[PDB]
Amino acid sequence: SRMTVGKMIELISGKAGVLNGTLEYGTCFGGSKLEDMSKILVDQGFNYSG
Amino acid sequence: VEIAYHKCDELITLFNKGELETQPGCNEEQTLEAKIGGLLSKVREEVGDVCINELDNWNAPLIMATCGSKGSTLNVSQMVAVVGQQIISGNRVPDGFQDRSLPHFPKNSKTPQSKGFVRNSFFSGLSPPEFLFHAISGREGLVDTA
Amino acid sequence: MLSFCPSCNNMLLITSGDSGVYTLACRSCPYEFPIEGIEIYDRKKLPRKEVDDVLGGGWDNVDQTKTQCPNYDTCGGESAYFFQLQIRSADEPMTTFYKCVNCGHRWKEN
Amino acid sequence: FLKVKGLVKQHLDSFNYFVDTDLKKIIKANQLILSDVDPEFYLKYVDIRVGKKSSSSTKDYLTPPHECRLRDMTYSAPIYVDIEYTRGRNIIMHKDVEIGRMPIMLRSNKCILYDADESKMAKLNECPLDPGGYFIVNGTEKVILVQEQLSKNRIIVEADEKKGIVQASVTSSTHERKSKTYVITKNGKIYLKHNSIAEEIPIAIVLKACGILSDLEIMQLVCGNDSSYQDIFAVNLEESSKLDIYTQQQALEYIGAKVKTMRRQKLTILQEGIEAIATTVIAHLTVEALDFREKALYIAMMTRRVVMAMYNPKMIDDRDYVGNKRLELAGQLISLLFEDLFKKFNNDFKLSIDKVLKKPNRAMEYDALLSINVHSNNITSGLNRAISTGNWSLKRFKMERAGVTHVLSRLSYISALGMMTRISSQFEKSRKVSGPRALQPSQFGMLCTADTPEGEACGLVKNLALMTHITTDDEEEPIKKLCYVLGVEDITLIDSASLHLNYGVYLNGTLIGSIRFPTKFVTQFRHLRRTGKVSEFISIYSNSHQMAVHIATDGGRICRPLIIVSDGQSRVKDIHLRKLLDGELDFDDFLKLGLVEYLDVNEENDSYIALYEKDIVPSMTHLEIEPFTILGAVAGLIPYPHHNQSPRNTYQCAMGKQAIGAIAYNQFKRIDTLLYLMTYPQQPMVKTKTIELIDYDKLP
Amino acid sequence: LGVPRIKEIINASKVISTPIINAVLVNDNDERAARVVKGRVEKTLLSDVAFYVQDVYKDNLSFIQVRIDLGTIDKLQLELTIEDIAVAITRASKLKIQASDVNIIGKDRIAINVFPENDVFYRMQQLRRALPDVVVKGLPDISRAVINIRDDGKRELLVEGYGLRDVMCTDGVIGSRTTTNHVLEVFSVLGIEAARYSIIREINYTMSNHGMSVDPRHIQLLGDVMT
Amino acid sequence: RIEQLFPVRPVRVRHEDVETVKREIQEALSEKPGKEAAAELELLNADHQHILRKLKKMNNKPERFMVFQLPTRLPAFERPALSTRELAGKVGSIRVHKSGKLSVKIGNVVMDIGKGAETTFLQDVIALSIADDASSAELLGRVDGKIVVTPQI
Amino acid sequence: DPVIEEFPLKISGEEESLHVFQYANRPRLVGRKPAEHPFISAARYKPKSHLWEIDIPLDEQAFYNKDKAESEWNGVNVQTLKGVGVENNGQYAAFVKDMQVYLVPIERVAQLKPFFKYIDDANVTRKQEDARRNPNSQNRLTGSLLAHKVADEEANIELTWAEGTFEQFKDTIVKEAEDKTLVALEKQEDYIDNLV
RNA sequence: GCCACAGAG
DNA sequence: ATTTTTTTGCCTTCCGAAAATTTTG
DNA sequence: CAAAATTTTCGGAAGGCATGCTCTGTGGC
């Protein structure tokens, strides 16, 4: 009902960043892309969607 | 969306030239706005319908919409597919500047993307003009509630 | 009537005067303009918008009748296109619209 | 940009402009004091300074801000005034005379924390990450909030369709006098009304009171060659004939017969009408001679705007347009308060001087300066009170504003940051949807699109964007001379009949003359601005509907820098960015080089801005520096806010100021009335560029 | 609709925003009959049926000449003639004119004379600027009229204005099926017992548009307490 | 001659045609015997040709004046530096090119030229003397047109 | 880009005090030809207030209304135009002498507008005659009030109007502007550097 | 105690 | 003793002024 | 018949009300 997809993207970006060891960016009209974080997650043995 | 945009541009061309047929109770601008709004609502409904029929079972927004516990088909369509036209006080986005909505669009522009149609889903991220138009609609809702 | 006095570019007004004849006179400077035998008129052409003939296009492929047009002194046509229409209540006769085929000048009756 | 112009620094700039420059204007407005008894006695304020003596090389000592916080004192610096007067028969002058204590804004040029390193911040028990921009009064830290008003010295046209009337209002605001004038429509006729005038005056009579004495000239100025405007306005030409007024003296008698202005001296009715037309009808336009052309053309332009509004109701001005609104910072408000305080001080001092001089038993003339202090404290007291209570009551300007200052919120670091840069709306009681409470598209990039509270103040109080600047006032006479040089024919030698056959030029809303080629004039003025010959905050914009080119010079306008695009290519290249990153060629060098320029809302109207480099067509005029400027400082905490719904972002802007966390580096040396701290704060995993820019990750 | 409609119904508001009268036509399946009925209720100004208005000054006589047109009247099919326009000019009491002055010249010209230190010029200027705004046909309170084709295909004539009685007394309009969303108008025309149905129906329609689903016994109680 | 004493009727143009008649009215006032950039370029070329022919027409004609509008600060000239009101003698030249454009060179700076606002009223030049023995004010001629010189930047 | 012909520009007359009159009511062109210049009978000029007053005798044979003027205006047969000379900088009145354009500085430009002094005189006479039948340290004036007072108290100067003096003026202007030629000093860019 | 803003749902 | 506003809509009662109608000469 | 008294109609101004319901804090007079 509230449609906060940005929250899910924040969760995946944070998970991939803490597995990779670097803080991520959720900058408006930009920021860290979802494909890179999915690649980081799948390289660490986790699911691409978190 | 490209088909709808091309048709809307055709209506803009006919309106600018002057051979646009008018509704029985409306003038040229009113019938242009009504036809464009109907076309954009139709394309939003079509994209939403092709979106909902494709989502597989055990999809959590789909389950929560089927139950009626929270959400609806429209919210799922807005998250996964086109958000749709932004409507302020029953009309499209008013001309905040002189004869246009934003300086990022040409003067006397009545294209769907220049007057409050958000192509992008909430998953794909909104462009700055679509972000501003959605902010206008949300602010109208907030003020009305307040 | 928008006219201005050529001497001082002030607005001209029309007064009756002692003689009872109207003149374009200036209340600022000694100037008058008599209009005896001279016509003055300030025409305000009101805008005219196109109107659709609400009865036009209805006299096509309809039966004819032998009714003399009221302009008998100018022409003597007899055949006229006629049709019936109900524009009134249901308890009073349904009116007839009929137009002459030679002189136009459409007219109706009950 | 944030290293030079910033977001919190705007307040500082205004306070700086109040201290270095505008105090001299306030002083020179009412610098002279006479005596009722002795005609040879006169007092003259020749200079003014704050927190510095003319003799001492080093600025005087002030208590540190944290000491003022702890001891419930007022962080302030004395006001020094140089005064020339007469003591007996010889004129004598005295410098560094204290007349009060100005509470100085923290981190301004008069503060102890100006350009101080982190070690000196640690020595003074002050956090280096404190935004500054507030006043410590009686121990409490209060912020003078930004006020939003309709544009001053500009004609604003509005209509009531349900009542059927139209009007054009001008709010003249000048250091000499402040007034409001209306040109209204009543019963199909046009009248001019003012607070000083008892009854509404027909527009023909007030136009005849000025230099215009012809009805044809009046009708040609108001209407021109358009037949519909003449048909609408011709009714008002008959009211001059109905009331048998035909010369300038008759109209001056008629106007002066119904003036309610109380005067100290008895004055002739003709002279009263001359005074009312010269100084009272339009306050910011004054005439010092027998020529009334500028005033006449101003009233004629107002009447023409009224007529154009009556012909079709779509030619009105939008009150919600950001280009029609100006922002008063702390400097302007403290100026408008200190003007009243200094006027009251001058009146009290003149009364005391007249009281002492009426006694003839003293052979030796006394020293007037010995009686400064017994009045001077009043200034300080009043000054402190106007920042302490927050009540803003000034009977001279009929101003009864409340809640000008607010206690600075210390619930979080971002809470104190967002209390700074907050706009207070003019209409606090407007409960109508899509009025002042709507999010206008005009505030794109100037005001935050998400930072507004939920509740009864939704849409009224609002916050600034990230990369914005608020213009400060600067002189317009060089701009006027430049206009005359560039090819503008002056208003005093052009034809009244052919004034509407070509574009007019409006300097600060005042019709200065006519221009044959408006586009070439605008291009030349932009070239002069980009080269650096005039100030970069002067705004040029051509309105084709009114056939005018407007040059705005005064302060209060919201601005925004943008990258210039010429011939389909962005003027900022890779070598410039490499130079900027290497250490040289900062934002000021970008301004002088002509790569970026400041656009206000009105100039943004006459523009075509590209959001990205890949979207540039040859017709584009400017390029966006970066898009997330459109979100403010508080809204910048949201990660991926373009994937969210807008009310979620608004609720986050509301609740981010209530989050519990670290306040400042000196939070354990502070004694605050209520302070929430978190034991183990952590910086966010998903950051934002705004988070790094405002140092939120240092105090999360 | 919505909350403002409820607000303006539950109080005896003499004037409301957007009042609609839904007249049912006697002949519902002809566009021409619908248009000629619409011409009887939709107000037509003098400016809509005139070529020019002008002020003429002669040697000793001063008047205002109006040239009406017959082509526009014939094509729009108004049941209006020249003498009807003259008597409509005389019936405008705000112009301060009487039938002794209005005269007919030709089949198109109408002359309004003026007779009496400067009163005649002012009075003729006032008359010239007020004359093309008089109402020669239609009801004085009807803002506009439209012809709506319903779902079943039959045509109805729905107007904005406050003259319910004049609409339902107009020939071509069934007076026994003409209604109005305005409630005090229905109370004045048809009585209190029809005002009660108007209240109940309007509140029920407003609630049902938003899908509130209130049981109409509460609405009946509210209407009974009001009436 | 008495036709000038007829009540003057002001110029009336319909509202939809006011933006189109401005060219015709502006050309009729003189009565010789980027889309906006192109329009102003055409207007500037026409103005240059009109200024050239009007300058050629008033050669040695008595009581014929034309008003120049130069910048209030002329370029500095070496003293025989000098104040703006102290200039005397030749200061520059009006030059005509093969394209028909006109340029006013003063000192070392070239500047544009345009005929500016069109006045519908009569102007004359009046000399003035406030000599106490006999104060006189003689007419010298009528102003026929106006030109404006602006810096080339 | 090459120049085909040049017209020299000369400046002279630093003490001429040349004024320019601007009649608000009199048009420049009637029909298609220049209009006839009005005949000036009297001229007055207040020196310290720069007030110009020009009297033009209007025709009494046609369109005069002798009754009104002889009754309530004391038979005024001339129209007077009043103006204030506004000091405009950068205006030069120029003529041509064999493709040589000579410029003379313009001191003031006056917007002459019709004046109705007889109406004010009649009004003040009526006020005095209706007030005398049955009646029923102070100089702090600054700005426009002081200017109006000093314009009211100061007396007009009856200037001797004359025509056909253009030949002597042209001779002295050409003679004063022929001996000297001034050498250019400022660079093109230095002029653009300040007061563009 | 009175005002004044600030927030919560 | 110069001199801004700072919501927006709805409602009844009053109170001259002018219009409409009847009533005296 | 038209002058004079009586009554009705019609405006603009003058009043009034609304501008949620609860709750928690501070700061200054």
Ligand SMILES: CCC[C@@H](C)[C@H]1CC[C@H]2[C@@H]3[C@H](O)C[C@@H]4C[C@H](O)CC[C@]4(C)[C@H]3C[C@H](O)[C@]12C
């Ligand atoms: C110019 C607008 C005038 C408008 C506000 C006036 C003119 C016509 C008036 C209505 C009619 O009189 C008929 C009704 C009479 C009842 O008693 C009260 C209601 C009723 C609907 C009236 C209300 C109101 O009084 C109206 C609409």
Ligand SMILES: [Zn+2]
């Ligand atoms: Zn006159």
Ligand SMILES: [Zn+2]
């Ligand atoms: Zn026939």
